Amino acid sequence: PKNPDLRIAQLRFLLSLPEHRGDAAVRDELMAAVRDNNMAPYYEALCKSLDWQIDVDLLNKMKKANEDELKRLDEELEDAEKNLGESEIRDAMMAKAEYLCRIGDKEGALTAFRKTYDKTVALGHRLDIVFYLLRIGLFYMDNDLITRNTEKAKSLIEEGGDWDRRNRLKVYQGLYCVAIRDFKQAAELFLDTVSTFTSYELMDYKTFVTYTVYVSMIALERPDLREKVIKGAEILEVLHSLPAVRQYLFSLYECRYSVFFQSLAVVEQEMKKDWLFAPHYRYYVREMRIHAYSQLLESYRSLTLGYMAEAFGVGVEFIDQELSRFIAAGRLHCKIDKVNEIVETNRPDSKNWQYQETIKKGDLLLNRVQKLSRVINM
Amino acid sequence: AHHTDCTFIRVSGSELVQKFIGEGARMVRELFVMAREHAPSIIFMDE
Amino acid sequence: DVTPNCRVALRNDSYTLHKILPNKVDPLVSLMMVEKVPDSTYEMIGGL
Amino acid sequence: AKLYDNLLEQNLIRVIEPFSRVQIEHISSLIKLSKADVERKLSQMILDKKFHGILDQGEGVLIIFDEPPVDKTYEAALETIQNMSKVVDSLYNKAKKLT
Amino acid sequence: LDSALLRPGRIDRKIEFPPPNEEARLDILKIHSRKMNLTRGINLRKIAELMPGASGAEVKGVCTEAGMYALRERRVHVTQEDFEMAVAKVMQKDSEK
Amino acid sequence: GGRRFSEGTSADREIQRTLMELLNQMDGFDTLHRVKMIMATNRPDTLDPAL
Amino acid sequence: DVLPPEADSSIMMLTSDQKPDVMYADIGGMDIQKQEVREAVELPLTHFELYKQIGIDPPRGVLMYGPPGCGKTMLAKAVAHHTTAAFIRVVGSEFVQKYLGEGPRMVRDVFRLAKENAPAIIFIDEIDAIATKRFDAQTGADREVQRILLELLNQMDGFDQNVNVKVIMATNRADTLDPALLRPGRLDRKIEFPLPDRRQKRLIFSTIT
Amino acid sequence: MSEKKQPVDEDNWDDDNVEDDFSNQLRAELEKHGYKMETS
Numbered sequence: 001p002k003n004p005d006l007r008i009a010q011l012r013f014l015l016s017l018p019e020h021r022g023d024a025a026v027r028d029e030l031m032a033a034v035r036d037n038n039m040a041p042y043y044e045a046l047c048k049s050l051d052w053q054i055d056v057d058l059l060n061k062m063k064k065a066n067e068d069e070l071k072r073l074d075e076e077l078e079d080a081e082k083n084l085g086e087s088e089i090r091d092a093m094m095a096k097a098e099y100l101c102r103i104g105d106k107e108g109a110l111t112a113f114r115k116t117y118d119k120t121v122a123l124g125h126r127l128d129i130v131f132y133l134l135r136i137g138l139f140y141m142d143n144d145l146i147t148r149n150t151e152k153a154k155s156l157i158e159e160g161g162d163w164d165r166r167n168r169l170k171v172y173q174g175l176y177c178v179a180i181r182d183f184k185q186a187a188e189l190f191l192d193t194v195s196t197f198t199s200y201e202l203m204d205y206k207t208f209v210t211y212t213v214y215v216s217m218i219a220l221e222r223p224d225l226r227e228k229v230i231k232g233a234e235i236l237e238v239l240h241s242l243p244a245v246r247q248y249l250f251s252l253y254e255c256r257y258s259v260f261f262q263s264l265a266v267v268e269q270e271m272k273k274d275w276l277f278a279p280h281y282r283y284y285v286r287e288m289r290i291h292a293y294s295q296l297l298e299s300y301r302s303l304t305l306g307y308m309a310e311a312f313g314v315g316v317e318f319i320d321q322e323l324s325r326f327i328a329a330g331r332l333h334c335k336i337d338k339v340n341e342i343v344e345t346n347r348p349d350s351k352n353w354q355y356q357e358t359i360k361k362g363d364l365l366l367n368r369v370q371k372l373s374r375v376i377n378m
Numbered sequence: 379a380h381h382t383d384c385t386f387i388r389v390s391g392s393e394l395v396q397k398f399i400g401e402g403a404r405m406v407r408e409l410f411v412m413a414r415e416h417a418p419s420i421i422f423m424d425e
Numbered sequence: 426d427v428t429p430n431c432r433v434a435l436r437n438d439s440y441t442l443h444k445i446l447p448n449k450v451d452p453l454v455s456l457m458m459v460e461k462v463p464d465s466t467y468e469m470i471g472g473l
Numbered sequence: 474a475k476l477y478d479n480l481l482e483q484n485l486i487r488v489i490e491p492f493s494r495v496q497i498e499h500i501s502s503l504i505k506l507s508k509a510d511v512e513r514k515l516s517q518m519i520l521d522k523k524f525h526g527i528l529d530q531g532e533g534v535l536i537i538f539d540e541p542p543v544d545k546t547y548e549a550a551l552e553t554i555q556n557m558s559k560v561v562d563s564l565y566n567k568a569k570k571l572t
Numbered sequence: 573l574d575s576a577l578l579r580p581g582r583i584d585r586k587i588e589f590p591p592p593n594e595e596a597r598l599d600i601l602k603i604h605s606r607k608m609n610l611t612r613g614i615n616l617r618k619i620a621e622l623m624p625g626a627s628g629a630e631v632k633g634v635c636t637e638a639g640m641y642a643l644r645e646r647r648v649h650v651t652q653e654d655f656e657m658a659v660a661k662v663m664q665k666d667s668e669k
Numbered sequence: 670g671g672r673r674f675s676e677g678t679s680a681d682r683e684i685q686r687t688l689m690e691l692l693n694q695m696d697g698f699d700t701l702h703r704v705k706m707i708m709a710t711n712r713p714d715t716l717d718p719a720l
Numbered sequence: 721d722v723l724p725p726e727a728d729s730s731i732m733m734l735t736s737d738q739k740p741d742v743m744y745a746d747i748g749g750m751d752i753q754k755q756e757v758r759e760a761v762e763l764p765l766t767h768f769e770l771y772k773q774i775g776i777d778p779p780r781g782v783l784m785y786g787p788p789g790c791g792k793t794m795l796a797k798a799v800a801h802h803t804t805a806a807f808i809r810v811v812g813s814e815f816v817q818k819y820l821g822e823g824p825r826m827v828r829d830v831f832r833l834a835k836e837n838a839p840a841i842i843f844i845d846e847i848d849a850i851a852t853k854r855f856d857a858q859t860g861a862d863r864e865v866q867r868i869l870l871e872l873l874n875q876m877d878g879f880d881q882n883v884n885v886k887v888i889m890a891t892n893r894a895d896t897l898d899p900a901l902l903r904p905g906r907l908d909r910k911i912e913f914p915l916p917d918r919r920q921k922r923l924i925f926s927t928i929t
Numbered sequence: 930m931s932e933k934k935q936p937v938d939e940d941n942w943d944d945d946n947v948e949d950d951f952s953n954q955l956r957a958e959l960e961k962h963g964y965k966m967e968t969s
């Protein structure tokens with residue numbers, strides 16, 4: 001069964017990558033692993049793990065129990081076909097092929113799925129099979145195979161409303177858009193937060209709340225924060241259960257810049273330890289800094305640099321080296337003076353900065369059709 | 379008939395249907411011409 | 426290739442047969458559609 | 474209270490209109506209000522971007538400037554680029570596979 | 573109907589179709605509730621008990637109608653009180669003649 | 670005139686149509702002004718109540 | 721050459737000297753049915769994306785009937801007066817032309833005018849003049865009518881929920897009809913006009929007096 | 930074809946740009962800010 005199956009992958013992440021933190025994960029992950037017939041996905045996890053020398057009988061009792069479930073499919077397919085129902089063979093392994101998917105690998109779980117895809121004339125089984133292929137397409141991070149059945153998925157919701165098959169689906173596309181650094185799309189798929197349910201994969205709905213606020217606080221601007229996430233009763237009460245995130249969100253909204261970094265180290269470090277955010281938490285807070293710098297710095301023109309330590313965040317030379325790499329990083333549109341100790345702003349009219357991305361994409365497609373025109377016709 | 383792929387043919391005894399059965403269809407048995415032409419078929423009737 | 430119950434293209438001067446006009450309708454698909462039964466499935470069966 | 478916010482800002486856009494720069498001490502006098510909450514509130518205008526401009530800390534000169542920038546020309550030519558890139562990606566699927 | 577039609581060699585099988593019990597009123601609310609834009613938390617069982625077995629068509633008669641409540645109050649998510657507001661109206665038509 | 674029928678003979682078909690043409694032509698979508706209708710029968714029993 | 725569409729029926733209800741100047745207030749005592757038809761006709765015309773967004777399948781066509789003198793023509797005059805979309809108003813006994821084909825072309829071009837023109841509103845009266853029940857392929861005067869009903873039967877099906885072409889049909893006797901016309905996908909909304917007894921009745925006394 | 934004379938012998942790229950900029954910089958913030966609390 002694939003409904004608890006993501007926590008398994010997250011605890012594989014919890015096992016391997018925190019290197020010192022490798023004891024309770026190889027306890028509880030084994031505690032889930034040498035039961036519920038799991039055989040295949042942890043041989044190289046045993047390689048990353050310790051020896052665990054006597055696993056032979058442990059594998060034999062479970063390939064034996066697996067052999068029981070396979071041999072009773074072999075007890076099922078022939079009474080299923082003598083008196084045929086709705087192809088009762090594929091009706092048996094249309095449900096036990098997911099047992100072949102958690103327990104077996106993707107091959108017996110894939111074929112039998114594309115096999116049983118042609119059985120049910122209605123999408124009430126088909127699209128949920130597609131949901132299973134999406135979920136294993138996440139487990140093996142099959143980033144191209146998700147592209148297929150996302151479209152093949154979406155091709156079925158137009159007939160019907162199927163908002164349990166679309167609002168559930170948008171959770172998947174939000175998790176992919178936050179898997180990659182596509183955050184304006186990740187919050188956009190995370191826009192509703194109402195028809196989203198107390199899920200299986202974010203079994204805390206409030207974890208989903210934390211994720212949509214963390215992506216939204218970059219993804220949308222104030223005209224959207226000061227109406228959207230500040231006036232949602234559906235969003236206010238669930239983080240009313242949160243002290244930190246409520247403070248962490250409001251420290252930007254209430255201009256509380258000094259306590260903002262305090263919670264930023266904690267939230268950013270939690271994002272460091274979190275699975276699937278671990279690729280991009282650096283990308284997160286490098287935007288959070290320059291966003292908080294730009295937000296205050298587009299209010300004043302003649303603000304000195306020794307203002308921001310005691311009021312914005314302490315360390316004058318820290319502000320110096322942090323701003324110098326952001327103007328020098330080509331963003332944070334201003335100009336800092338040094339030996340009269342004052343920071344000036346400017347304004348770029350949207351004619352140069354807007355031009356920049358245009359010449360970027362033009363050079364990219366120039367590279368593209370350059371490369372193709374070399375490739376084809378020898 | 380949808381799942382076993384039988385020709386689901388109900389009858390209503392309407393007269394718009396009648397022109398496809400025949401000019402008059404003095405019987406109902408003229409329907410069997412099309413029925414054995416769609417030979418795995420199911421005829422359906424109302425009250 | 427000449428099928429019974431099939432349209433044709435026809436020249437008009439000598440009524441020489443010109444070309445096979447594709448196909449028109451089944452006499453069951455036509456009236457059948459005119460009826461428009463609400464097609465169903467197992468997946469919409471409530472407890473039967 | 475919330476109507477008083479919109480009335481406060483209705484006056485606040487009203488008196489700020491006819492000029493480019495002023496000191497906060499005159500607009501505090503001309504709305505007949507303080508300078509700290511007016512300074513923070515003007516900062517919230519240029520945080521929420523409902524009004525745009527800049528502020529000063531040395532004496533509080535609000536530099537007001539506006540022009541509508543050219544936007545339609547560049548980005549609408551820019552998304553055609555990422556259409557056509559995908560078109561060339563489809564050209565793999567009839568060109569690279571085929572000949 | 574006809575007794576010659578009730579000749580025992582004539583008919584091969586007669587199958588009875590009962591009105592739904594409380595469980596079979598629940599699942600037609602389930603299937604029929606699929607295509608609607610819902611709000612989280614409904615307890616369809618209560619609403620299935622609010623109808624004491626009309627048929628499989630009053631299920632669709634209610635649950636189609638409950639969106640007219642949310643639309644007439646300009647919602648985009650169907651809430652549970654539209655359903656009990658709809659059972660009060662459809663079951664009034666059960667109470668009419 | 671007629672009352673209506675349950676569609677007996679072929680003749681009444683277009684005659685009922687001819688009647689309903691007249692009925693819609695009486696007070697359907699028109700300011701019927703300056704034109705006065707005077708009718709007569711021996712039996713007012715074979716008549717459409719809608720007439 | 722390809723042509724812009726054309727139909728020689730009521731052109732398009734010329735909208736200047738065409739309003740039957742009937743207010744909603746002129747109709748007393750139809751609180752349920754006037755609000756209900758407002759839901760059915762012009763509410764999906766304007767507020768289309770609530771029907772789209774929730775997805776509750778707004779109705780294709782609508783039938784209304786009952787005893788005569790129950791405001792059947794009158795409500796069409798009021799909705800026809802206060803509407804905003806283009807309105808098409810036909811006298812439904814006119815399709816029986818002497819020449820053949822003028823009827824079916826006369827069917828299809830009206831619908832093409834609703835297609836070309838606007839998210840528009842069809843109104844048909846005296847549906848019993850077309851939709852009877854029995855038929856006879858021995859006259860031709862019946863066979864033409866048979867081909868009339870086939871055209872409209874197809875062309876109602878030839879929609880895709882995208883056009884807001886709403887068909888309003890008003891009759892007197894529901895009995896003398898084919899329920900194949902009343903198939904869902906074609907007809908889903910049926911409105912009887914019962915006679916008010918006292919309650920809405922005194923409202924008509926208030927309005928008329 | 931492909932004789933090729935031998936004189937010698939997403940998942941990656943968004944990770945590669947954040948590898949470019951996010952390269953060699955303190956790696957372990959849980960304590961840097963908590964030690965700037967009292968020093969700064």
Ligand SMILES: Nc1ncnc2c1ncn2[C@@H]1O[C@H](COP(=O)(O)OP(=O)(O)OP(=O)(O)O)[C@@H](O)[C@H]1O
Nearest residue numbers: 719746747748749788789790791792793794795924
């Ligand atoms: N508020 C009202 N409710 C009902 N009837 C009214 C009202 N006000 C006036 N009437 C009268 O009822 C008649 C309804 O007009 P209309 O032509 O719509 O009748 P109908 O229902 O179309 O019946 P028919 O098809 O025979 O004309 C009008 O002629 C009018 O005199």
Ligand SMILES: [Mg+2]
Nearest residue numbers: 697789792793
């Ligand atoms: Mg009338």
